[PDB]
């Protein structure tokens, strides 16, 4: 049963089982092309593949580029094989993954970091092409060798950037895993404290914050509760602008900029696909 993956220059321990064919799942170690995501049986087979494989980046359209960081929009109907490979690969680290086979109704936003050999996979999020529940993320992953460096938050931030450009309010697909809820709560806090740090008025509505940030009103209210910023005095509810919370936020956001782990809206060249 599958225990590790060879992926470019990394060797990755798998968290959960993924339904690779038994011919492969029978092995303990699976070899992957880091660019087209084909899975193979041995180092030897991979080496032969790497001599033949033309791909040096995801398929699809590069819609974000800031220096060495890119995001590629892959259509699951146009690149079924790549997206299915991506889906089997993500299930090695997702406890509960929506689906694997029918990738056609989904778009995949694949984030990469470039060096002189090509555009290497950092992570991705999928997104329903047409979601009744207005979910702007279906699943999201940062590859293990990249985890806990701020790329997950860039992926989340990017998913809301798409929503803004579509003039939509978005929300992640329920249910949220523990790692996902921690990351979303961190992002929501950042976005809420940033808005309030910049707003000079003395009253605001949830809808106003929601329409500016593309964040859903319920998650806004939920973050306000988590921050203990919803108080009750006399008859109505008030927002408590906690000094420390924004004080810690400017110190934290200083460190974020310093490390360049931010998405930059002016680096997005994108018009929403096949729905506008």
């Amino acid at each position: 049963m599958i225990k590790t993956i060879a992926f470019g220059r990394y060797e990755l321990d798998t968290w959960y089982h993924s339904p690779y064919p038994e011919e492969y799942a029978r092995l303990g170690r699976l070899y992957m092309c880091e660019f087209c995501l084909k899975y193979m049986k041995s180092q030897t087979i991979l080496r032969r593949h790497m001599a033949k494989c033309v791909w040096k980046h995801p398929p699809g359209d590069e819609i974000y580029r800031k220096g060495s960081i890119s995001v590629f929009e892959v259509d699951g109907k146009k690149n079924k094989i790549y997206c299915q490979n991506l889906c089997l690969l993500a299930k090695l680290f997702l406890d509960h993954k929506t689906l694997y086979y029918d990738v056609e109704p989904f778009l995949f936003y694949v984030m990469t970091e470039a060096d002189n050999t090509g555009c290497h996979l950092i992570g991705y999020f999928s997104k329903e092409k047409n979601s009744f529940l207005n979910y702007n993320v279906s699943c999201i992953l940062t590859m293990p060798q990249y985890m806990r460096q701020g790329y997950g938050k860039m992926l989340i931030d990017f998913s809301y950037l798409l929503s803004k450009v579509e003039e939509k309010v978005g929300s992640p697909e329920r249910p949220l895993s523990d790692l996902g809820l921690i990351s979303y709560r961190s992002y929501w806090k950042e976005v809420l404290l940033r808005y309030l740090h910049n707003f000079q008025g003395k009253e605001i509505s949830i809808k106003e914050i929601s329409q500016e940030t593309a964040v859903n009103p319920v998650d806004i209210v939920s973050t306000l509760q988590a921050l203990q910023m919803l108080k009750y005095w006399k008859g109505k509810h008030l927002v408590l602008k906690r000094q420390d919370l924004i004080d810690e936020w400017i110190a934290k956001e200083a460190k974020r900029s310093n490390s360049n782990k931010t998405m930059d809206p002016s680096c997005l060249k994108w018009t929403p696909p096949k729905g506008t």
Partner: peptide
């Protein structure tokens, strides 16, 4: 008809999404 429920300091509450809410610093 967009409203949210939860509790603040042992008190169940209910909040509108369109009503302006007042921002404060540290007064009472």
């Amino acid at each position: 008809q967009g409203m949210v429920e939860i509790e603040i300091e042992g008190r169940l509450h209910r909040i509108s999404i369109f009503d302006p809410l007042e921002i404060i610093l540290e007064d009472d």
